[PDB]
Amino acid sequence: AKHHPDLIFCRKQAGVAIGRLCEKCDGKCVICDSYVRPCTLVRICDECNYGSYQGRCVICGGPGVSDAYYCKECTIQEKDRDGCPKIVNLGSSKTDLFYE
Amino acid sequence: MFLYNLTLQRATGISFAIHGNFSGTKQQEIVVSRGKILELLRPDPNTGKVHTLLTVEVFGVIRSLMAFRLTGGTKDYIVVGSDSGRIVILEYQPSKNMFEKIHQETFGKSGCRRIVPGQFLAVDPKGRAVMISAIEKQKLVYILNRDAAARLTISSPLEAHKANTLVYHVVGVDVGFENPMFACLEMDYEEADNDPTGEAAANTQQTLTFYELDLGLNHVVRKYSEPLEEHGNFLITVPGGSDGPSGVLICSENYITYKNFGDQPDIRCPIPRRRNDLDDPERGMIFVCSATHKTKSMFFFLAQTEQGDIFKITLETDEDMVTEIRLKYFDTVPVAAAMCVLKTGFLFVASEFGNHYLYQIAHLGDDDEEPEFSSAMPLEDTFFFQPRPLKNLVLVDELDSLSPILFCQIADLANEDTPQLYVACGRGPRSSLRVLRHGLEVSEMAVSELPGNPNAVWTVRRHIEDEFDAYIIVSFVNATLVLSIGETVEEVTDSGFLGTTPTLSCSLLGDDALVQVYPDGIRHIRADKRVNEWKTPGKKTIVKCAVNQRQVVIALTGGELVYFEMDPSGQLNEYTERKEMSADVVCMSLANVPPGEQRSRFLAVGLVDNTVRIISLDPSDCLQPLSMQALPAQPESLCIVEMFLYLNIGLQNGVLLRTVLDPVTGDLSDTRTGSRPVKLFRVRMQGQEAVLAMSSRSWLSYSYQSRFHLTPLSYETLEFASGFASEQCPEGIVAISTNTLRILALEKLGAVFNQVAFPLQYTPRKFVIHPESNNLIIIETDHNAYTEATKAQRKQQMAEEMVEAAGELAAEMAAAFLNENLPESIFGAPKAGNGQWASVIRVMNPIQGNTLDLVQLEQNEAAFSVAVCRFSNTGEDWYVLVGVAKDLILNPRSVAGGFVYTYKLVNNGEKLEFLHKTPVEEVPAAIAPFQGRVLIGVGKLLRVYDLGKKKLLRKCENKHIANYISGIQTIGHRVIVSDVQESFIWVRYKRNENQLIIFADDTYPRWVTTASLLDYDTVAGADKFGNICVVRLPPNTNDEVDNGASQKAEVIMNYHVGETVLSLQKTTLIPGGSESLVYTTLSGGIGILVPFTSHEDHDFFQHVEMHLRSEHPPLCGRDHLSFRSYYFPVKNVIDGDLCEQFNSMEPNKQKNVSEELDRTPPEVSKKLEDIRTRYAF
Amino acid sequence: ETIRRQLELEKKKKQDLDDEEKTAKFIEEQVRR
RNA sequence: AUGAUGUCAUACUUAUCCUGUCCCUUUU
RNA sequence: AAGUGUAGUAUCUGUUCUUAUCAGUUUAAUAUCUGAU
Incomplete structure (x- = not known):
């Protein structure tokens, strides 16, 4: 991501699941990282949601509230048809913040 | 130049076909898939008439069409595979007469990519699953399941990525509620990719891979792998379970092999051939298409060969294995692209070219004097076939669908004011010069x-x-x-x-x-x-x-x-x-x-x-x-x-x-x-x-x-x-x-x-209108064939060979081969040759249907272009210049020589005479007039010749051409040369100095197939990749001259035609209306582009398009911006085809569009009808 | 501010409608010939 | 008369970021 | 006379190669580096 270049997207095969984003990251684009002009809905991976992994935030990684969508800039650029955009990695962010 | 797209006639050609009870009733429907439009037909059982029950533009490239029927149902779904990565399962809605999208699931990126599924789509027999596979490195298996509300729920897909595995085809295995399997003819490419010696490239045999979708494991797995003797072309799933055995019959070059699963053995059966056929021996035979008539009692298959001879395959089954493959000559049909054996004894045979066919299945293939060649019958040697006319089928109707419109001329060739569209379409024996007229017969x-x-x-x-x-x-x-x-x-x-x-x-x-x-x-x-x-x-x-x-x-x-x-x-x-x-x-x-x-x-x-x-x-x-x-x-x-x-x-x-x-x-x-x-x-x-x-x-x-x-x-x-x-x-x-x-x-x-239409013998290349005689000269040329004299020589040689057998010598059967010439249009054209070709010049009466003049070229000759014009040194002798090439080939290793026969065309424009025969250099592909001289294209050379005594004296030459002269448009002073690989180039021909100089060039290239002079500086051109562009020269073009070139031009128009256009002569259609550009298509469509004469009208159309892009999108999942910008971007083109959906749009969509546009829905209807009334018929 | 263009837009629409009516009358007179 | 070097200061960009937890380690 | 942290970038200050050659790595080529006179 623009805020977290050291992140690793899942890039898994798409499923039939609809994801949700954390309330703190409400409205943020999953790929474009923008805040306006959404086009398409976000599809979660099959393994990306199974029990405890169900209901988590796509980008924020926390408990989701609202249903997310792909940014229109990402949809027109043929970017929304990619793999599962689940943030599997968690590093270089919120690591030492718990220490503070 | 803000143009508006207008489709006058939809595409009649059939690319994919399915047959089933999609309407949900006892009637059987036929779903046809053209290049960019789907259709649902419900032909008359008693009347035998095929009515277009529904026709909807898919707004995409339909690449595969496979049916679906869930367990315990009475209405069949429709799987629509498109160029986009969205798998769509639609369902009929006769109550509303609209195709409803039941499910849509994204799979990958856009474009017909090698790793993009869409090249192959299959549906299992049990209706429990579907499969989508690309050309290579992609295989997805979607699971269908019935809901509590009978809602077909699409489950998540199974990944079956198989690297370095090129899939030739896909088919469904037979499973009676057990673990289903899907078969594919895979080929390994990774081994030969590391063989500099070229040996591993050979000894690379295609293998049938049967992958089982384990319902318990919820993952695909390579169940079985079986090599074959030679590469295959098509597969057919023998129905299993209670009805018939399981297995997949694979067709290959001169072979058909039944190798089912388990311990069943492989049963082989070669493809027959025509007895004393004039075709080439080296040319094999492959199964063009096949259908299966599944009945509770038994099951048979009807398979069309490359020569159109429809054979009847019967699967002789043992107690638990395959006994033998029983083949029999069912009938003689045209070059078949698809076959559907519907109920009530009907066979819909759609050809790759020409009108469709719908025959009545009268004879069941048995109870006749025709022999049944079986796999158990040995031979060493192929079973010669005795072809005959339609004995087991009766032609009930014929769906016209004028397909390959090679050329087009929209003009008042007749004495009437309503102009006629003389459009040539066909393939050799299927030639037809249809004089289309806007009316009703x-x-x-x-x-x-x-x-x-x-x-x-x-x-x-x-x-x-x-x-x-x-x-x-x-x-x-x-x-x-x-x-x-x-x-x-x-x-x-x-x-x-x-x-x-x-x-x-x-x-x-x-x-x-x-x-x-x-x-x-x-x-x-x-x-x-x-x-x-x-x-x-x-x-x-x-x-x-x-x-x-x-x-x-x-x-x-x-x-x-x-x-x-x-x-x-x-x-x-x-x-x-x-x-x-x-x-x-x-x-x-x-x-x-x-x-x-x-x-x-x-x-x-x-x-x-x-x-x-x-x-x-x-x-x-x-x-x-x-x-x-x-x-x-x-x-x-x-x-x-x-x-x-x-x-x-x-x-x-x-x-x-x-x-x-x-x-x-x-x-x-x-x-x-x-x-x-x-x-x-x-x-x-x-x-x-x-x-x-x-x-x-x-x-x-x-x-x-x-x-x-x-x-x-x-x-x-x-x-x-x-x-x-x-x-x-x-x-x-x-x-x-x-x-x-x-x-x-x-x-x-x-x-x-x-x-x-006024049919012809060979396939057409171009047309020239006789001004005074009001006649039309068509260049009938078709490669990979033999001349009539060539056919006679081959028949005489075969007769001598048969007489040399000395078989009681006494067999007086050669006279039957010499005299009984089968119909080239009905029983197929037995033509062949890798380099052999043929050409024929023909002038016929347009109002009549007679050929007033005919002329034959040599056997090793092949025509490429023709025209008619007068010479400056000559008087009113309108000479007909026709260029042809000898010893040509589709492979990149042919040229030999070129000849430009100088037809005289005298006797009140009804007497051709090739006096002069100036030989060319490379492969000629163009001839036009310019200042009275003949501007011809010899490969990468533009020769302005003058009609001499012996040959056209090359009065001027230009060697600035890049690849090859594909098109030459003669302006009043300049000339537009369109290359095969390069875009158009405007060259000025100084007559005082007698020198041609390239005035400018184009920025983006395009494989130009046709061209049209729009104005003194505007030129429109098609694209071999399916594009239509319009380049307008700027005011600052230095007409006087003395990255690649100096002067460049801009692209003023860009729009994806959807189908390969090959003719554009936009002029004046309905008299009293504004002139427009009529464009043809290789799939049988004639559209008309007209300009927006008002900025307010342009803004209204733009708002309408922007609203329709989100209100009533396509069913194939493709975007309008992507469907229009496939090869190159869109440039000032309003897709009126998508605009026409406002009349068919839902009422809520109509109200939303009227609100977004600040007008009434009938206001939008009147605005849309105004353009069609002003610019078209 | 947009109301001014809206009034001007309606005036231009009426002018274009009158021009289209005249063009249709002329085309009908030509078709009669 | 452009540059390489790197302790030590300085401006900037990523609409970067403050309630984040042991809901999961319960191995002897 | 107040800002917290997470990654990266540039402009500032101080120092160094008149080593003649050969071979190699590396470089687009230099350069740098590695061994001998």
Whole structure:
């Protein structure tokens, strides 16, 4: 991501699941990282949601509230048809913040 | 140049085909998939006529079409594989007549990528799963499951990525509720990718990989792998379970192999060949297509070969294994692209070129003298086939669908003003020069001369239960006659009219009661022998009348009208009022009693003072005016009809006015039907009521997919009209012409254009119009074939070879091979050759169908271009220059030499003579005039030659061409040269110095296939990749001259045509309209691009497109911006095809569009119809 | 501010409608010929 | 008369970011 | 006379190669580096 270049997207095969984003990251684009002009809905991976992994935030990684969508800039650029955009990695962010 | 796309004729070619009960009823439907449009057909079981039940533009590249039927259902889904990575499962909606998207799931990126699934799509037999596979490195398996509400839920897909595995095809295995399996003909490419010696490239055999989708493991796995002897071409799943055994029959070059699963062995059967066939021995045979007739008793397959000979495969099955493969010559069919064996004994065979076919399955393949070649029958040697005509099939109908339109010329080649579109399409024996004309062909059932001066015609039935016509009244100038319609048309007098004078009207008043009106008065003749007459009080003459289902209005002189009501007991009650109009009535209109109402609400009356008025016919406002309407001309007639109704009125001029039906008059529309009076009558066709015209042309307007549309009838003018119906005549027009009768009928309800072709021998290349003779010279050239003299030489050689066998020598069978020449069009053209080709010059009468002149080239020759023009040094001798090439080849290793035969074309433009024969250098592909000289393209050289004594003296040469001269457009001073790999280039030819110099070039390249001169600096060109562009030179172009080149031009127009266009000569279509660019397509479509003459109109169209992009998107999941910008981006092109969905859009979508546009939905409809009326026919 | 263009837009629409009516009348007169 | 070097300061960009938890380690 | 942290970038200050050659790595080529006179 623009805020977290050291992140690793899942890039898994798409499923039939609809994801949700954390309330703190409400409205943020999953790929474009923008805040306006959404086009398409976000599809979660099959393994990306199974029990405890169900209901988590796509980008924020926390408990989701609202249903997310792909940014229109990402949809027109043929970017929304990619793999599962689940943030599997968690590093270089919120690591030492718990220490503070 | 803001152009607007307009599709006049949709694509008729069939690319994919499926057959099944998709309508959810007992009827069997046929789903056809063209290049960019889907269609659903429900042909007549009894009538045997194929009607286009539904046609919807997919807005995408339909690459695969496979059906689906869930377990325990009675309605089949439709899997639509597109160029996009979205797998779509749609379902029919006959209640709304719209294709409903049941499920849509994204799989990958866009574009027909190698790693993009869409090249192969399969559905299992159990209906439990579907599979999508790309050309390589992709395989997804989607699971279908029934919901509690019977909602087909698409589960997540299974990943089956197999690297370095190229999939040749896919098919479903047979499983009776067990672990299903899917078969694919895979080929490994990774091993040969690391073989510099080239050895591992060979010994790389394709293998049948059967992957099992374990329902328990929920993951695909390589279940079985089985190599084959040679590479295959197609697969067919033998149905298993309770019906037949499991297995997959694979066709390969001169072989068909049944190798089922388990311990079953491989059974082989070679492909037969034609006995003493003139084809090449090195050319093998492959299964072009195959269908299966699954029955509860047994199952057979019908497979078409490369030569079109449809063979009948029967799977001889043992107790638990395959016994043998029984093949038999079923029939001889054309080059088959798809085959569907539907119920009720029907076989829909769609060819890759030419009209479709729909035969009746009469013989089951057995009980005949034809032999059955079986896999157990040894041979060493192939079983020679004895072809014959259609013995087991009968051709019921033929779906025209004019496909490959190689060339096109839209001009008044005939003596008429309505220009004809001479369009050549076909493939060798399937040649057809269709002179398309915008109209409707009325099948003349019968015609009979009427004496005197016939004035009017009407047709009244016998009773309410009568399913056919009973009486036909013909009002002469001084009398009226009646005829009884009972398959015995003769005189009739016992009807009860007593009309010794001309009658003003005659119809069926009640369920069986007749109501006649003559100038003497009215006469009600009930079902019994009774005729209640009612005289006209006073000297006022009956001016007009109008009947209804339960009401009858009469109009005398001075605007004195009278009403009559049909009582429930059959009594005719006279109106209790004397309604006086503003003036005398030129005509009146009255609607029919609907099912719910007992009479009409409003009734129309037009005065002689050019004004119409509708008055309430109800009792609350009886004889009360309701709404006025302006008439700028003398009203000629009036008519109202349903389909949501409308009111039409023909004026005294050659034009008419239509408006919406309501308590008041709404919008207004007009079109010149005209140079004749606008007469109108009622008719009923296609299960819909409509208005039949009577003017200079019979414009027959009817609803066409929720949209009014009208074309004229291709016949003489009609003076009076009425409907006729019987057992022989389902629904037709009984019409009175000038002293003649005509019982015509037009079933073709597909509003488009009618045509009749003049076929040829070889496939066409181009056309040249003879100006003085008004003839047409077509260059018939087809490669991979032999000449007629070549065929004779080969036949003589084969005859000598057969006679050299000395087989009791005494076998007098060679005469049958020498004399009995099978039909090249019916039994196929036995042609071959890797480099052998053939050409033929032909000049034929366009109005006629005869070839006035024919000329044959050599056997090793091949034509590429032709033209006709006069020489500057010569007089009025319009010479025909035709270029051809010898020893050519599709592979990149052919040139040999080029020849430009100099045809004389004399004797009143009807006598060709190739005097001069100047030889070319490379491969000639162009010839045109320029300053009286002949500008020709010799490869990468432009030669301006002058017609000499021996050969065209090359008076000037230019060597600036990049790859090869693909097109040459001769401007007044410049010349547009379009290369094969490079874009257009404008070159100026200084005549004083005699030097050609490239004036500029293009920025983006395009494989130009055709071209057109738009203006003095604008040039339009197609693209081999399916694009159409328009380059306009700037004002600063240095016409005087002395990254690649100096001067460059800009791209002023860009739009994806969707289908490969190959002809563009936009000029003037419907006379009185604005000129436009008519563009053809290789898939049988003729569209028209026209400009937006208003910035406000451009903004309105842009807003409409921006709204429709999100309101009513396509079903294939492709985006309009992507569907239009596939090869190159869009540049000022408004896709009117997507705009046409506003008429078919839902009501909520219509309201949303009207709100976003700040106008009415009928406002948008009128705005859309205005462009079609102004710029098209 | 947009109301001014809206009034001007309606005026231009009426002018274009009158021009289209004249063009249709001319085309009808030509078709009569 | 451009540069390489790297302790030590300085401006900037990523619409960067403050309630984040042991809901999961319960191995002897 | 107040800002917290997570990654990266540039402009500032101080120092160094008149080593003649050969071979190699590396470089687009230099350069740098590695061994001998």
